[PDB]
Design a protein around this ligand. Structure first.
Ligand SMILES: [Zn+2]
Ligand SMILES: [Zn+2]
Lengths: 249, 249
């Protein structure tokens, strides 16, 4: 399987998003488009309890042929937030594109952002905290460790390490983590298992244009390093019957 | 009203703890002694949601004639933790003594620590988060801002400001804020209103001996600066009928 952009090469054809196996063709899929005015409020959607996000560590990263995957291994976890149980933070990655728009998978009122960061949590089924990233005129110190380590994982399957930093510094301030949307869905990559509880935050994280451009300039999809990594996003999926909730009243 | 140590001067007598007015003589009072083995577990006592503790600020402090009071004004608040509603963080202060023991008001299994920090929250009746402080061989950077500003509030009613810092850096890591004790009680200073929900944490905060000694060496109880501030603790109160809960099973 590969993203649309990967099937543009005359030779070496492979399965585009429209031809993905597994549960990819099912009913409840992700991403989705959030229509703010149609969301129902649910009081129970109170801010999450972040355990271990304040711990600085050396995070092992790698180019997994689809994105930059940063392994967390349970050094942190989330409790509460109307979740069924406690979830251990397993990994983190991002989806991005060419410009300031049409780079995020989900969209809030038809608007796409520059990138989208996904924090996957394994039920101690999947709790994925999705954040939108916007490009700004200010350097975001919290994203510096990741940016600096990209030049090392240029080649697919490369492995490296990010200097001492915490998950907290990458996320927006806690006073901005009040408003979010919640809905049942699935992974946005094969086999697209429909066992995910999504939490997409309203407030985006802001990084500088140069930190942004650094991703596609350094990462590659293939061994020969001919295709720079970008447009690694899956197109919007139909809402179907499910409802999308908002933490706010 | 004044603490025991203040009634030792031959002249100028005033109301010691045993002669405090208001609700001070009532049934449900604080501090108390926590007997770990007699505490009942309550699942609902999950970690608190800290809102705004990660925000660095210039905190206005003052010697309020009884301790160092650091005003927070609601820049932060707590939600959850089986509390009835959301509580706004109003102020912070400490109680201390002469040595590594017998300096904390509460005690865990008859053991007292060097100091005790109180974070008061106004119901948006009172939610007070109490932390024990232990003296160690390592400098605690998070406590540096407060220590440096003590030399300024030496005189009673003095006012000053603490350099940019956050409430978070003073508290122990989140992975250590799982275990705590909860019980109904009151303020430990007149008028001793019995409208407090206490949360005393098991894991103490560690500061250097020199940061410790800095408190009594700099603060004074009186205008003429004759009595250094220490032993500003109230003696243990009888448990009575109420039960003390533990977050852990
Ligand atoms: Zn993803
Ligand atoms: Zn107190």
């Amino acid at each position: 399987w590969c993203y649309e952009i990967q099937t543009e090469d005359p030779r070496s054809s492979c399965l585009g998003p429209e031809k993905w196996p597994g549960a990819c063709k099912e009913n409840q899929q992700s991403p989705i488009n959030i229509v703010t005015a149609r969301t129902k409020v649910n009081p129970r959607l109170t801010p999450f309890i972040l355990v271990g996000y304040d711990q600085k560590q050396q995070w092992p990263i790698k180019n997994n042929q689809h994105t930059v995957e940063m392994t967390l291994g349970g050094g942190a976890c989330i409790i509460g937030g109307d979740l069924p149980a406690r979830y251990e933070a397993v990994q983190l990655h991002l989806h991005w594109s060419n410009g300031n728009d049409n780079g995020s998978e989900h969209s809030i009122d038809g608007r796409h952002f520059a990138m989208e960061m996904h924090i996957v949590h394994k039920k101690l089924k999947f709790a994925v905290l999705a954040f939108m990233i916007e490009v700004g005129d200010k350097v975001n110190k919290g994203f510096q460790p990741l940016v600096e380590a990209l030049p090392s994982i240029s080649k697919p399957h490369s492995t490296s390490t990010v200097r001492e930093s915490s998950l907290q510094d990458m996320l927006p301030p806690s006073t901005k983590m009040y408003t979010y949307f919640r809905y049942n869905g699935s992974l946005t990559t094969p086999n697209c298992d429909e066992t995910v509880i999504w939490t997409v935050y309203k407030q985006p994280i802001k990084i500088h244009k140069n930190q942004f451009l650094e991703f596609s300039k350094n990462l590659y999809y293939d061994e020969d390093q001919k295709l720079n990594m970008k447009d690694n996003v899956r197109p919007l999926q139909p809402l179907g019957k499910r409802q999308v909730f908002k933490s706010h009243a």
